[PDB]
Design a protein around this ligand. Structure first.
Ligand SMILES: Cc1nsc(N[C@H]2CCC[C@]2(C)CO)n1
Lengths: 156, 39
């Protein structure tokens, strides 16, 4: 099917009409998304099948057709852009300065932008257009607004 | 059954809308991949 690099919507016909359950990145022949989007199930691209290759529930990531390819990291200083792909809406770049999730195992960048659940898997990019992580796994803060981690995998 | 549809190129946009704050939060990550606030 379509193997061109880019951002894709992840759709299902199981529920009412066609529903967007998430988003992902196609890079170097590999489709990258969040685990909670597909639950590790197979995907279709036209007549072609995409089979999971690697996944991890704790990282909340999954790759299809090959190993995780995205290795760029947030530099800890600069603004980034969320390339939000909301359900039924055009892809839109939103520029933001990431905050920080501080954990017992280290710090990770976080983006304070709220979008519908079906936007999970939308890529976060640096000024060179490199994907530094995916949007969609995070937390609800005191106010009630959403803060996503900048979730990146490891390129082995 | 799930299927994918192209939605765009991955490129940085000059003059994109700039929004969002930068909170510093103490968080915990559980074995199920769920983040929670530590206070
Ligand atoms: C064991 C593990 N699986 S994913 C993960 N992620 C860490 C790596 C640095 C901080 C983090 C994002 C949250 O504690 N750590």
């Amino acid at each position: 099917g379509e193997t061109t690099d880019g951002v894709y919507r992840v759709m299902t016909r199981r529920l009412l009409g066609s529903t967007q359950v998430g988003v992902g990145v196609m890079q170097e022949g590999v489709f990258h998304t969040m685990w909670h989007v597909t639950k590790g199930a197979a995907l279709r691209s036209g007549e072609g099948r995409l089979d999971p290759y690697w996944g991890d529930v704790k990282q909340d990531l999954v790759s299809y057709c090959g190993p995780w390819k995205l290795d760029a990291a947030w530099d800890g200083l600069s603004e980034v852009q969320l390339l939000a792909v909301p359900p039924g809406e055009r892809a839109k770049n939103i520029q933001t300065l990431p905050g920080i999730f501080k954990t017992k195992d280290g710090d990770i960048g976080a983006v304070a932008l709220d979008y519908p659940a079906g936007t999970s898997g939308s890529p976060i990019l640096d000024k060179c257009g490199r994907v530094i992580g995916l949007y969609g796994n995070g937390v609800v803060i005191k106010n009630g607004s959403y803060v996503s981690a900048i979730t990146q995998g490891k390129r082995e | 059954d799930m299927y994918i549809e192209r939605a765009g190129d991955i490129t940085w946009e000059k003059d994109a809308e700039v929004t969002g704050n930068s909170p510093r939060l103490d968080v915990a990550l559980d074995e199920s991949g769920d983040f929670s606030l530590v206070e």
